[PDB]
Amino acid sequence: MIQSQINRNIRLDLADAILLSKAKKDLSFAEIADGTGLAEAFVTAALLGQQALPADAARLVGAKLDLDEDSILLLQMIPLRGCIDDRIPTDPTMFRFYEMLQVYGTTLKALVHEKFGDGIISAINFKLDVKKVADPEGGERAVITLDGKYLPTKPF
Amino acid sequence: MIQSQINRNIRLDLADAILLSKAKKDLSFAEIADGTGLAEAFVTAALLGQQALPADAARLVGAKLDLDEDSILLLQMIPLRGCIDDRIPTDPTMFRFYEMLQVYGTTLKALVHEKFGDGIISAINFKLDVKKVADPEGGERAVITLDGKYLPTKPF
Amino acid sequence: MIQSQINRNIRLDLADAILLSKAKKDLSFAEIADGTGLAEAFVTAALLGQQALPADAARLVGAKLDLDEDSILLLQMIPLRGCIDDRIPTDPTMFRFYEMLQVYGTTLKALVHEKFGDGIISAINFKLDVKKVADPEGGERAVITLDGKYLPTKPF
Amino acid sequence: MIQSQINRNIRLDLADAILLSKAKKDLSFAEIADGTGLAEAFVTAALLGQQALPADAARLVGAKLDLDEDSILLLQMIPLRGCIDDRIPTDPTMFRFYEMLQVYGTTLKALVHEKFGDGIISAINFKLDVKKVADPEGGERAVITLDGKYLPTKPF
Amino acid sequence: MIQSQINRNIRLDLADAILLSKAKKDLSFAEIADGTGLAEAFVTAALLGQQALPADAARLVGAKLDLDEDSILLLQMIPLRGCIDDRIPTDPTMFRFYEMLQVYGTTLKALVHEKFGDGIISAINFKLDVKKVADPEGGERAVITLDGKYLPTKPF
Amino acid sequence: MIQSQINRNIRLDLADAILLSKAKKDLSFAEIADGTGLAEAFVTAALLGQQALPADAARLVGAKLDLDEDSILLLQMIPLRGCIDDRIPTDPTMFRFYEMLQVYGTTLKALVHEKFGDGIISAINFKLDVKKVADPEGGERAVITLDGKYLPTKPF
Amino acid sequence: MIQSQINRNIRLDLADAILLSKAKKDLSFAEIADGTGLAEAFVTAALLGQQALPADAARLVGAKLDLDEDSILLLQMIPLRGCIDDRIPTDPTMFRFYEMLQVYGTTLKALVHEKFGDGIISAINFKLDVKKVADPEGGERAVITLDGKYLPTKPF
Amino acid sequence: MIQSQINRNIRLDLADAILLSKAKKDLSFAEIADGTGLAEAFVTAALLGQQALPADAARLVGAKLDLDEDSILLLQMIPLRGCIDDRIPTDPTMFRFYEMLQVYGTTLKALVHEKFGDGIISAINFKLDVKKVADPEGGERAVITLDGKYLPTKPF
Amino acid sequence: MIQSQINRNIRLDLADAILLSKAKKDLSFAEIADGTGLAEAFVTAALLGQQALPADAARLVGAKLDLDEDSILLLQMIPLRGCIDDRIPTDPTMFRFYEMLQVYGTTLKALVHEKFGDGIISAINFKLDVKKVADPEGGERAVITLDGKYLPTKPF
Amino acid sequence: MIQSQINRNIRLDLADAILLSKAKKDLSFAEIADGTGLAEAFVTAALLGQQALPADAARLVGAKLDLDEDSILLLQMIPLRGCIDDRIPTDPTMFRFYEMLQVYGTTLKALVHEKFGDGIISAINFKLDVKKVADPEGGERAVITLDGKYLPTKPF
Ligand SMILES: O=C([O-])C(=O)[O-]
Ligand SMILES: O=C([O-])C(=O)[O-]
Ligand SMILES: O=C([O-])C(=O)[O-]
Ligand SMILES: O=C([O-])C(=O)[O-]
Ligand SMILES: O=C([O-])C(=O)[O-]
């Protein structure tokens, strides 16, 4: 039977414990996700309290991280989502993503309406991924692809 | 000589006037940007107060929208950026992007550090674009590509 | 060509002007919406800056309210939505709906997950209506129906 | 003698304990409410810290969840209600209900005044329920019914 | 037909204009409410944007204050209520009432539940009045009487 | 020697322990205050962290509730007052008193100045009480009397 | 008949006009208050929207500053007090006084209770003054005297 | 070697411990400061986490209060200052000093600039003291003296 | 006679007008400050509402910018300082300086206490300058020098 | 394998423990950083939770402070940065740096755009240092040097 959380702190505390274990075992997110059949972004978000793992996957990562039974069970709960501590990120790495919205949020709205119509790009029927690409001018770039379903707003 | 703004409301008020003129003329952002040599995302962000147009681009869009000289000048000023009224968008369309961060913000941090290292993905050495594509399951999707330079954090 | 707003105050100021004309003509929202082919809640939300009217509906309500051409065009724009002035309503009538969420928000989450699964009830693929009904014990009740599509959150 | 709480964290900590026991026993909210004679939304809200259980219901759910005597006692206390952590939900599922108010809040006020008169729809003489209905286009919908008494505001 | 507002500033702007006219004519709230058949507290609240006046009361105060037709119409609209500028009063006089709640709010909760049961004392089925009384120790006291209906919270 | 607190959580934690003891013993606030010679509103406020009890009353209530010596000492400390968790109550029962201020705050200011003059109604030279009165139309009402000294603001 | 304000912006806008007139006439606060019979801190507070002038003083300062009749009348209104724009001062000069409270606020509470008892030092039965005094080590110091009546909190 | 804190909670938790010890021993702040050579306001502020004691004073108060070695060491650390829990005091006693600034903050700015010039009155080169004195009209008053160095703002 | 402001918007509105004129005239901040004898950071801050110009400098810049007499007078007023619209900058350029404090703020405190002792580095007896320096690895760097007086916090 | 944190409190709690050990050993930050090959500002920032130490440095500071293995491991994790408890510092020493931005933030933006162009001064390709030097007029000054790469914002 599906089970859900209402207080984000239970899974975020579990995330901190997972990260300590992960660091002690010197493991990567890539290798933790390897073998689950699930995308690295999904598995990672789950460890970090923002997705639910199916049972087999929760047992697999729970074996790798030496997690107890309650922790393996918690990983299967649908989370009370929300990773930002207080609305605006304090961390530079997370903040740059918020700033992309402060600069382009209205442009995103305008071009979404122009290309699709009234409505939204979904954050639910949605996936993201992060790719590393060489910068021709030197160095590296991240290409983060946000891929969401258009849901129209129609008169009724 | 470069010129800069310190109060966002000047350019945001100009944006509202631009949008009224744009509606009266039944124009698209695509056609406004046409002939500028500049990406639709960039030109649109400028009209909306979040970027500066070069002089030639400003004259061009100014002619399309019947803008007075002061307005054309304002479009060239470096803006006081920040499109979100009060930190968290109230608009559903803009809000979904913020929600992508509430769900995936810590994952983005985690995978950026794993893939690149300590540091950030830049919001300055940076571009984005919006594409519409059919969903293989029926309907349409937006593919929003965020493309930023990795800047390392190193000890000193 | 679809046209969209980025600052809510343009449409909200128009709403105030609409309400004054509505009051001077002694009109109801029901009679304003009648003949548009559209639900009273949708048309009312449009007048109040939270939905866009199709052209014929905008011309029709604009005739009943004696709106100028700019106002009729503004009603056709996709709005920057958000009717609450500062996150928490001050008005008792609006506030009660917020309180229903303070009391039942977590129950709605829990029961949605149990009945449907992980994911959300859409506020986009969505309609609302307000029905007045006699209370069997005396007096009257409102039955407000929230009717939204279930969108699953699935692993990937 | 009736007993009441003044700090929501006591009952919210209890709710977290209850959800862990519920998950360990693989129980549903429907099974837990069944036999109490109380609506599932009402029982669920109580477990989650937002309603008080009568003594017999508290003993019945307490037995099902293997709760101690203090926990069964706490369930009978009148709570310090307020399920949202910090005013605006972070969780997408709960958030959608808040957005329905950001879009339709002023429409609800407007139509409530037109249909009933000055005053409010109560959040106290009030019930809600969640029903799953098939979407004729495919998929599922939730119909959430908010059913509240009208209380008039009258001159004095 | 009843008419309602959605932006408090329209009626609060009218209140400022009313207060200037009131001062120029050197009138009291007591005189203004006289003849209206309505309590001073209710008529005063309406002038200040927090209640609606019936049409005859509106015309009567409007004649006293020399108000134009749009102002007398505005006074009959159901207001978007909320007199506190930003949640916590800055004014000492108003602030003391807020501080009575900071000190006794949990006591009021506790004693309401003990005396009446779960539920609330209404702010809608409700009246207030202010009386001046001599203090036996010297000086004057305000006796402010809050009088609201108990509405029970019952299981269902 | 008088002793005072600077962090509300010490006394608020004690309040929660008091409420659990109170509930285990199935006591009322009326019976707790009985024999102290002090008003129920004052004694209740002290238990809930918002007043100090004189030593004799502290020992009396401490006996009834089986409190340890440090708890009885804590009850005699002058508190760091402030019962509302985060400025605006979340609990419906407490909230209604805040709404009475959102609706009538400016009327209270206006009528206080008119009846008494510039200055305030004190929240210090002050008492409150709660009475239950039958409603002639059916049901029950609370009459809450706020009774404060007028302190004038005078030029100097 | 006494008159009162409910929106601080009316007297704050008048303050800005007063300051521009004062600057044009190159006047000081000391010379504006001289001849009024009223303390410089009281007169200055009135000009700046935080106190009400008696009629003669209002006319006297109105003549010095060349104010119109509505402005002279406004100065006589009891203000909606609150000089800080948004809770915490942005201006360094005002900020230092807030910082004195962030450092010494709990010490002020502790020593007030120790010296006087439970209760407060009044902000109403209160005066302040600003004196300049040579610093023996060189330079100048301000001695700002806050002088308030003790009001006790007593059991009832 | 000087040592400094970065999280106020460590010293604020110590302040609570000190206050409990102080109450158990029935001590005054005046007695605690006696023999230190230091003003009661400075020593009290240190106990409450807002100042650092020199080693000899820390040992002396530590002996009076039976503090352990870690606590005596903590008292010598330079604090992360800030005694107000969340910007605006909830406590009536502390709040009145904040209200003094809401009423007189702009007057203090204005008169400081007139008497001294552009710049500030220091909160660092600064002392404060609290005196109790009889009110000639009956009762008691606090004279709180804020004594700070004028630091000019000069062009450069 | 020195003159001061109490509402930042008067000078910030002047700043926007200054910036439009500066742009129409294609002027740099460097050339506006040239001839004034004042550092470019100081003159620029004054234009932007954060410092006062001496009379001669105000007339000089007034001449270059074609400002009216009221504007030149306004420039000489001591401002109500605070350039950030709402606590945290929205603009990326400004925001990076805030982030420097989010990363190094506690290190600044720690190292100031270690090097100088308890107290502060002044923001009043203070100057700042901005230099452009070539980056040995290519491109350009800003070296921004913050230079402030240490004021000690000593016992008294 | 690189490891990262998502909740600042883990490393901030570690910082408090580090600071206690540091004080018990009477160490300076200069002495701690000595032998590490890294700048005092960088190593201090890491101890305080705002940078990551390379393994050799972590083991070395770990030996000096007698940290356990988990603690040495934690110091090598990439932090969730953000040292300011709640947006605006409460501590005077940290606050002065924030004030420097309230006074000069728009000047920094203006002069950066003039000297470099549209874009930013990086907080990532960035270093700072704190120097103590005598003030020619007596006393001591801090020279804090902010040194960041210019990254341009260019059309695309
Ligand atoms: O965002 C950036 O690119 C930065 O701060 O360096
Ligand atoms: O985000 C969504 O997909 C929605 O609300 O329908
Ligand atoms: O919500 C209610 O029912 C009320 O306030 O009367
Ligand atoms: O509330 C009060 O009584 C005061 O401030 O004087
Ligand atoms: O407050 C002070 O003394 C300062 O910042 O210079």
PDB file of C-alpha atoms in Angstrom, chain B:
ATOM      1  CA  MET B   1      29.286  55.286 -23.405  1.00  0.00           C
ATOM      2  CA  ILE B   2      27.503  52.411 -21.590  1.00  0.00           C
ATOM      3  CA  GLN B   3      24.506  53.410 -19.373  1.00  0.00           C
ATOM      4  CA  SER B   4      22.892  51.425 -16.500  1.00  0.00           C
ATOM      5  CA  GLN B   5      19.645  51.459 -14.523  1.00  0.00           C
ATOM      6  CA  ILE B   6      19.276  51.075 -10.711  1.00  0.00           C
ATOM      7  CA  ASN B   7      15.477  50.796 -10.340  1.00  0.00           C
ATOM      8  CA  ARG B   8      13.740  47.989 -12.226  1.00  0.00           C
ATOM      9  CA  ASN B   9      10.382  49.765 -12.500  1.00  0.00           C
ATOM     10  CA  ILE B  10      11.551  52.142 -15.276  1.00  0.00           C
ATOM     11  CA  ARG B  11      12.219  49.258 -17.699  1.00  0.00           C
ATOM     12  CA  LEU B  12       9.309  47.204 -16.355  1.00  0.00           C
ATOM     13  CA  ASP B  13       6.892  50.083 -17.069  1.00  0.00           C
ATOM     14  CA  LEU B  14       8.453  50.301 -20.544  1.00  0.00           C
ATOM     15  CA  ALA B  15       7.828  46.556 -20.918  1.00  0.00           C
ATOM     16  CA  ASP B  16       4.086  47.027 -20.187  1.00  0.00           C
ATOM     17  CA  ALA B  17       3.914  49.805 -22.844  1.00  0.00           C
ATOM     18  CA  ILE B  18       5.777  47.526 -25.283  1.00  0.00           C
ATOM     19  CA  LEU B  19       3.306  44.704 -24.696  1.00  0.00           C
ATOM     20  CA  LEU B  20       0.307  46.970 -25.273  1.00  0.00           C
ATOM     21  CA  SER B  21       1.772  48.249 -28.581  1.00  0.00           C
ATOM     22  CA  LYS B  22       2.708  44.652 -29.505  1.00  0.00           C
ATOM     23  CA  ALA B  23      -0.881  43.511 -28.874  1.00  0.00           C
ATOM     24  CA  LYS B  24      -2.379  46.450 -30.812  1.00  0.00           C
ATOM     25  CA  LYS B  25      -0.145  45.529 -33.784  1.00  0.00           C
ATOM     26  CA  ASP B  26      -0.866  41.811 -33.329  1.00  0.00           C
ATOM     27  CA  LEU B  27       2.882  40.998 -33.422  1.00  0.00           C
ATOM     28  CA  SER B  28       4.779  37.876 -32.228  1.00  0.00           C
ATOM     29  CA  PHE B  29       8.074  37.852 -30.316  1.00  0.00           C
ATOM     30  CA  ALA B  30       9.453  35.762 -33.205  1.00  0.00           C
ATOM     31  CA  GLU B  31       8.774  38.523 -35.734  1.00  0.00           C
ATOM     32  CA  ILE B  32      10.017  41.258 -33.444  1.00  0.00           C
ATOM     33  CA  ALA B  33      13.377  39.447 -33.111  1.00  0.00           C
ATOM     34  CA  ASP B  34      13.510  38.690 -36.879  1.00  0.00           C
ATOM     35  CA  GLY B  35      16.126  40.845 -38.594  1.00  0.00           C
ATOM     36  CA  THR B  36      18.017  41.643 -35.381  1.00  0.00           C
ATOM     37  CA  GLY B  37      20.495  38.801 -35.853  1.00  0.00           C
ATOM     38  CA  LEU B  38      19.683  37.896 -32.183  1.00  0.00           C
ATOM     39  CA  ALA B  39      18.037  34.915 -30.519  1.00  0.00           C
ATOM     40  CA  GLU B  40      14.313  35.227 -29.782  1.00  0.00           C
ATOM     41  CA  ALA B  41      15.052  34.461 -26.070  1.00  0.00           C
ATOM     42  CA  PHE B  42      17.585  37.290 -25.885  1.00  0.00           C
ATOM     43  CA  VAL B  43      15.480  39.923 -27.725  1.00  0.00           C
ATOM     44  CA  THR B  44      12.334  39.039 -25.740  1.00  0.00           C
ATOM     45  CA  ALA B  45      14.241  39.223 -22.442  1.00  0.00           C
ATOM     46  CA  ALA B  46      15.424  42.695 -23.463  1.00  0.00           C
ATOM     47  CA  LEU B  47      11.861  43.938 -24.293  1.00  0.00           C
ATOM     48  CA  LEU B  48      10.848  42.565 -20.838  1.00  0.00           C
ATOM     49  CA  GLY B  49      13.559  44.544 -19.063  1.00  0.00           C
ATOM     50  CA  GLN B  50      16.105  41.745 -18.407  1.00  0.00           C
ATOM     51  CA  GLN B  51      18.720  42.445 -21.093  1.00  0.00           C
ATOM     52  CA  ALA B  52      20.150  45.414 -23.018  1.00  0.00           C
ATOM     53  CA  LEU B  53      19.795  45.723 -26.798  1.00  0.00           C
ATOM     54  CA  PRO B  54      22.631  46.938 -28.956  1.00  0.00           C
ATOM     55  CA  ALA B  55      21.774  50.319 -30.679  1.00  0.00           C
ATOM     56  CA  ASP B  56      20.902  48.802 -34.054  1.00  0.00           C
ATOM     57  CA  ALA B  57      18.652  46.121 -32.573  1.00  0.00           C
ATOM     58  CA  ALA B  58      16.945  48.790 -30.377  1.00  0.00           C
ATOM     59  CA  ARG B  59      16.240  51.047 -33.394  1.00  0.00           C
ATOM     60  CA  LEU B  60      14.868  48.103 -35.316  1.00  0.00           C
ATOM     61  CA  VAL B  61      12.424  46.782 -32.672  1.00  0.00           C
ATOM     62  CA  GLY B  62      11.606  50.439 -31.765  1.00  0.00           C
ATOM     63  CA  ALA B  63      10.471  51.049 -35.351  1.00  0.00           C
ATOM     64  CA  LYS B  64       8.371  47.841 -35.267  1.00  0.00           C
ATOM     65  CA  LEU B  65       6.581  48.868 -32.056  1.00  0.00           C
ATOM     66  CA  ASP B  66       6.454  52.608 -32.753  1.00  0.00           C
ATOM     67  CA  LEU B  67       8.544  53.536 -29.685  1.00  0.00           C
ATOM     68  CA  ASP B  68       9.628  57.100 -28.941  1.00  0.00           C
ATOM     69  CA  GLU B  69      13.313  58.075 -28.710  1.00  0.00           C
ATOM     70  CA  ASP B  70      13.487  57.942 -24.912  1.00  0.00           C
ATOM     71  CA  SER B  71      12.143  54.327 -25.063  1.00  0.00           C
ATOM     72  CA  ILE B  72      14.624  53.283 -27.701  1.00  0.00           C
ATOM     73  CA  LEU B  73      17.376  54.780 -25.477  1.00  0.00           C
ATOM     74  CA  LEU B  74      16.038  52.922 -22.415  1.00  0.00           C
ATOM     75  CA  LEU B  75      16.200  49.589 -24.293  1.00  0.00           C
ATOM     76  CA  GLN B  76      19.982  50.107 -24.607  1.00  0.00           C
ATOM     77  CA  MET B  77      20.555  50.668 -20.890  1.00  0.00           C
ATOM     78  CA  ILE B  78      21.988  47.834 -18.838  1.00  0.00           C
ATOM     79  CA  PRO B  79      18.993  46.786 -16.728  1.00  0.00           C
ATOM     80  CA  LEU B  80      18.526  46.391 -12.969  1.00  0.00           C
ATOM     81  CA  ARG B  81      17.557  42.764 -13.486  1.00  0.00           C
ATOM     82  CA  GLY B  82      14.905  40.728 -11.605  1.00  0.00           C
ATOM     83  CA  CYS B  83      11.624  39.777 -13.314  1.00  0.00           C
ATOM     84  CA  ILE B  84       9.925  38.057 -10.314  1.00  0.00           C
ATOM     85  CA  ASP B  85       7.722  40.538  -8.436  1.00  0.00           C
ATOM     86  CA  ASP B  86       8.303  39.156  -4.910  1.00  0.00           C
ATOM     87  CA  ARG B  87      10.713  36.184  -4.887  1.00  0.00           C
ATOM     88  CA  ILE B  88       8.242  33.372  -5.514  1.00  0.00           C
ATOM     89  CA  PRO B  89       6.270  33.680  -8.799  1.00  0.00           C
ATOM     90  CA  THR B  90       2.504  33.898  -8.416  1.00  0.00           C
ATOM     91  CA  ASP B  91       1.917  33.018 -12.076  1.00  0.00           C
ATOM     92  CA  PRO B  92       1.373  29.228 -12.668  1.00  0.00           C
ATOM     93  CA  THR B  93       3.429  29.287 -15.894  1.00  0.00           C
ATOM     94  CA  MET B  94       6.471  30.973 -14.206  1.00  0.00           C
ATOM     95  CA  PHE B  95       5.893  29.033 -10.942  1.00  0.00           C
ATOM     96  CA  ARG B  96       6.441  25.584 -12.597  1.00  0.00           C
ATOM     97  CA  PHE B  97      10.065  26.535 -13.300  1.00  0.00           C
ATOM     98  CA  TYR B  98      10.502  27.512  -9.679  1.00  0.00           C
ATOM     99  CA  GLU B  99       8.964  24.150  -8.682  1.00  0.00           C
ATOM    100  CA  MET B 100      11.532  22.335 -10.847  1.00  0.00           C
ATOM    101  CA  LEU B 101      14.073  23.877  -8.525  1.00  0.00           C
ATOM    102  CA  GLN B 102      12.135  22.969  -5.327  1.00  0.00           C
ATOM    103  CA  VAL B 103      12.164  19.319  -6.479  1.00  0.00           C
ATOM    104  CA  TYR B 104      15.543  19.047  -8.277  1.00  0.00           C
ATOM    105  CA  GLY B 105      17.661  21.937  -6.871  1.00  0.00           C
ATOM    106  CA  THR B 106      19.751  19.736  -4.516  1.00  0.00           C
ATOM    107  CA  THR B 107      20.089  17.059  -7.264  1.00  0.00           C
ATOM    108  CA  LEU B 108      21.405  19.708  -9.628  1.00  0.00           C
ATOM    109  CA  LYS B 109      23.929  20.721  -6.985  1.00  0.00           C
ATOM    110  CA  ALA B 110      24.898  17.082  -6.290  1.00  0.00           C
ATOM    111  CA  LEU B 111      25.346  16.087  -9.958  1.00  0.00           C
ATOM    112  CA  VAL B 112      27.133  19.322 -10.912  1.00  0.00           C
ATOM    113  CA  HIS B 113      29.715  18.633  -8.183  1.00  0.00           C
ATOM    114  CA  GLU B 114      30.069  14.972  -9.255  1.00  0.00           C
ATOM    115  CA  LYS B 115      30.315  15.720 -12.994  1.00  0.00           C
ATOM    116  CA  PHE B 116      32.358  18.948 -12.847  1.00  0.00           C
ATOM    117  CA  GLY B 117      33.649  19.620  -9.318  1.00  0.00           C
ATOM    118  CA  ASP B 118      33.199  22.336  -6.645  1.00  0.00           C
ATOM    119  CA  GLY B 119      31.971  25.578  -8.189  1.00  0.00           C
ATOM    120  CA  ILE B 120      28.917  26.600 -10.197  1.00  0.00           C
ATOM    121  CA  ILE B 121      27.186  26.428 -13.508  1.00  0.00           C
ATOM    122  CA  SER B 122      27.186  30.114 -14.575  1.00  0.00           C
ATOM    123  CA  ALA B 123      23.995  32.127 -15.155  1.00  0.00           C
ATOM    124  CA  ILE B 124      26.132  34.757 -16.993  1.00  0.00           C
ATOM    125  CA  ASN B 125      28.248  32.766 -19.409  1.00  0.00           C
ATOM    126  CA  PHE B 126      24.943  31.272 -20.282  1.00  0.00           C
ATOM    127  CA  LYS B 127      22.178  30.825 -22.822  1.00  0.00           C
ATOM    128  CA  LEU B 128      18.816  29.113 -22.983  1.00  0.00           C
ATOM    129  CA  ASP B 129      16.225  28.221 -25.594  1.00  0.00           C
ATOM    130  CA  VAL B 130      12.733  26.874 -25.776  1.00  0.00           C
ATOM    131  CA  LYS B 131      11.652  24.247 -28.349  1.00  0.00           C
ATOM    132  CA  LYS B 132       8.276  22.761 -28.957  1.00  0.00           C
ATOM    133  CA  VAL B 133       8.134  19.072 -29.948  1.00  0.00           C
ATOM    134  CA  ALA B 134       5.439  16.507 -30.199  1.00  0.00           C
ATOM    135  CA  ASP B 135       5.087  14.092 -27.326  1.00  0.00           C
ATOM    136  CA  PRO B 136       5.322  10.496 -28.718  1.00  0.00           C
ATOM    137  CA  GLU B 137       2.341   9.779 -26.383  1.00  0.00           C
ATOM    138  CA  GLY B 138       0.169  12.556 -27.890  1.00  0.00           C
ATOM    139  CA  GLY B 139       0.261  16.289 -27.173  1.00  0.00           C
ATOM    140  CA  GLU B 140       3.240  18.604 -27.055  1.00  0.00           C
ATOM    141  CA  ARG B 141       6.294  19.116 -24.917  1.00  0.00           C
ATOM    142  CA  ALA B 142       8.642  21.951 -24.255  1.00  0.00           C
ATOM    143  CA  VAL B 143      12.369  21.251 -24.261  1.00  0.00           C
ATOM    144  CA  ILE B 144      14.041  24.081 -22.417  1.00  0.00           C
ATOM    145  CA  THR B 145      17.813  23.888 -22.676  1.00  0.00           C
ATOM    146  CA  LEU B 146      19.945  25.591 -20.004  1.00  0.00           C
ATOM    147  CA  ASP B 147      23.528  25.920 -21.202  1.00  0.00           C
ATOM    148  CA  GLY B 148      26.097  27.328 -18.819  1.00  0.00           C
ATOM    149  CA  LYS B 149      29.858  27.421 -18.301  1.00  0.00           C
ATOM    150  CA  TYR B 150      31.320  25.471 -15.376  1.00  0.00           C
ATOM    151  CA  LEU B 151      33.361  27.810 -13.184  1.00  0.00           C
ATOM    152  CA  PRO B 152      35.450  25.947 -10.572  1.00  0.00           C
ATOM    153  CA  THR B 153      35.828  26.769  -6.897  1.00  0.00           C
ATOM    154  CA  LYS B 154      39.501  26.120  -6.020  1.00  0.00           C
ATOM    155  CA  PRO B 155      41.487  26.497  -2.816  1.00  0.00           C
ATOM    156  CA  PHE B 156      43.824  29.502  -2.583  1.00  0.00           C
TER     157      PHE B 156
END
